[PDB]
Point group: D2
Chain length 114, copies 4
């Protein structure tokens, strides 16, 4: 009615080991970078094309901890979270924006290995 | 699986009328802005709290045409798209990145309500 | 690989007034029925075909209480839940299965009008 | 908006081999069964409880042909479809309903892991 719905679903692999950070000012946070791709074989070129998107995902608390422990580069994972654009001034005085996929509360992540 | 899943689902209100453009031998394109919110009936100083996110949605083809003809500020809509981050040069000629929800052949847009 | 993912996302209208019930536990349950539709076009159906699915949705606790008080025949509503097939024996005393969209602690229900 | 949204996202493992069947009139249709589970060590005792849901997933055309060749018992897949409840009278004159996850034109299936 005014709240609305803000839902991201991803399945993809980590392009790097997770970077995890503890804080007795909150507890864990983990940043992960996920790739999702799209493959082609275009008529012009003759040979294969491809286009990969990198997604910045931030996990918190128990999930961040889980991430530090199990998730490594190349790992396949499922994520339900939400979009968050945050503002920051960089060192040369410029206002900048980073939109991230944040998994909290009623988001999820799951590992599609074994 | 290299490929993966890249899906965004939004339900929210347009913050402005749709901003519509044709193109080279143009197909239609339309940039819209969707608000989604999260209350927080907190302590604070006496009352609740609020954070809204604005999402940058881009529509192509018939949907772009449709949005221009029948969508206005405050319309409630459901959107299914995918995340895309594009790079672009700014007024000073440094890099700037924008992540947006692109609604494509695969996506959907529906007007909600009563 | 166990657990997996079990997610239903619905937007539609109540076919009926919500039926609310309290279980001996103490806590509410609401059974609602939600209509979604898809429209057609065809050839020796120069007419338009419409198929509507009725989904059986069950809500527990506070979300059931909310439903009773606020939701009505016609209300449009957004639901995240999971699929449950329950088994039940009928008057002749034989086995029958019903698959329902259960909205739990994992899921959500949101009123899309006011 | 009558119409609305009817979406199922599943990630799970095939409980058995794909049952595929061709039509000399409308190509392949494949039936697969997918498990999703939920574990909790709870409560009275301290012992491990499981509950698994089985989903009847129907694939059409090219996804069905793909399923035939590559999908086996235990394969892990991601599915995006819609719910369908169909009616049928069984042989002892009684009305029955089966609810199924249908993967159409707007859905997808992706094979996961490795």
């Amino acid at each position: 009615a005014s709240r609305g719905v803000n839902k991201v679903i991803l399945v993809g692999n980590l392009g790097q080991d997770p970077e995890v950070r503890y804080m007795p000012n909150g507890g864990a946070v983990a940043n992960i970078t996920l790739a999702t791709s799209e493959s082609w074989r275009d008529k012009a070129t003759g040979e294969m094309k491809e286009q990969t998107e990198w997604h910045r995902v931030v996990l918190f608390g128990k999930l961040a901890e889980v991430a530090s422990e199990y998730l490594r580069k190349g790992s396949q994972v499922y994520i339900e979270g939400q979009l968050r654009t945050r503002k920051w001034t960089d060192q040369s005085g410029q206002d900048r924006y980073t939109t991230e996929v944040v998994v909290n509360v009623g988001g999820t992540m799951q590992m599609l290995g074994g």
